[PDB]
Design a binder for this molecule. Structure first.
Ligand SMILES: CCCCNc1ncc(C(=O)N(C)CCCC)c(N[C@H]2CC[C@H](O)CC2)n1
Ligand SMILES: [Cl-]
Ligand SMILES: [Cl-]
Ligand SMILES: [Cl-]
Ligand SMILES: [Cl-]
Ligand SMILES: [Mg+2]
Length: 248
């Protein structure tokens, strides 16, 4: 990975934007090769840089800092998304001052973007393992891209065993569609995490939102079929969403 590494001097770190897993995420400035500086986010691997898709977050590079004691502390440089995560954006839209009421057309486009992003990763046999609205970021052109690659998002087979495939990502995508259609509801209202396995095992699934089209609910429902092989691929789901969108 001698290609992805960036000189520490080219990076300036600022405030903390949020906590994530095993370390804090911070704002920063990255001086580029063209002399200009770019706003970035820094998580305090080489294959991710090979990823290239407008609906997938790009790796800008990584830096390694040596602390006063010589302890190494690696840092992952990612683009700065001022509009933030999609999950939070959906909730803000429900309030005044925040963005306007997001129409169905725009909501579907969010789903398409995510489907396009996953289609790209699925073709490279890369598993996401944590797809959710909170892990989808909004770019300055208001297009969505997947990032950050949780019991209520994990597929039924992935709970029973440690088996995980693209069909598991499809399951989580179905839930993400539901978050979007409901504008940020927590999955399975009235159901607690420790009850999820028995809840799904008994055949229960996420219920249809009030103003959600039958055609749309059919798409997301197909993601939750018990047998992973019965679930459609991302390339299928993407075209279904696209056709449904153009029909409006
Ligand atoms: C998950 C991929 C990280 C992408 N980088 C990034 N960019 C911007 C923000 C952010 O929080 N902003 C602009 C504030 C929103 C104002 C509307 C950001 N936040 C992180 C998201 C993921 C979380 O684990 C830590 C905070 N990340
Ligand atoms: Cl710094
Ligand atoms: Cl916002
Ligand atoms: Cl809610
Ligand atoms: Cl539900
Ligand atoms: Mg996260």
């Amino acid at each position: 990975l001698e290609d992805v590494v960036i000189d520490r001097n080219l990076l300036i770190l600022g405030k903390i934007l949020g906590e994530g897993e095993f370390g804090s995420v911070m704002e920063g400035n990255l001086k580029q090769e063209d002399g200009t500086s770019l706003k970035v986010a820094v998580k305090t691997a080489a294959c991710m840089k090979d990823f290239s898709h407008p609906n997938v977050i790009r790796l800008l590079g990584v830096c390694i800092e040596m602390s006063s004691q010589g302890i190494p502390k690696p840092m992952v440089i990612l683009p700065f998304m001022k509009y933030g995560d999609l999950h939070t954006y959906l909730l803000y839209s429900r309030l005044e001052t925040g963005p306007k009421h997001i129409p169905l057309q725009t909501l579907l486009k969010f789903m398409v973007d995510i489907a396009l992003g996953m289609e790209y990763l699925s073709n490279r046999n890369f598993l996401h393992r944590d797809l959710a609205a909170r892990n989808c970021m909004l770019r300055d052109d208001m297009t969505v891209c997947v990032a950050d690659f949780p019991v209520k998002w994990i597929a039924i087979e992935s709970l029973a065993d440690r088996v995980y495939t693209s069909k598991s990502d499809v399951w989580a995508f179905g839930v993400t569609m539901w978050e979007i259609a409901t504008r940020g509801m927590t999955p399975y209202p009235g159901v607690q995490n420790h009850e999820m396995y028995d809840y799904l095992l008994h055949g229960h699934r996420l219920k249809q939102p009030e103003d959600c089209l039958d055609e749309l609910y059919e798409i997301m429902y197909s993601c939750w079929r018990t047998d992973p092989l019965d679930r459609p691929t991302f390339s299928v789901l993407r075209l279904q969403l696209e056709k449904l969108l153009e029909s409006l």
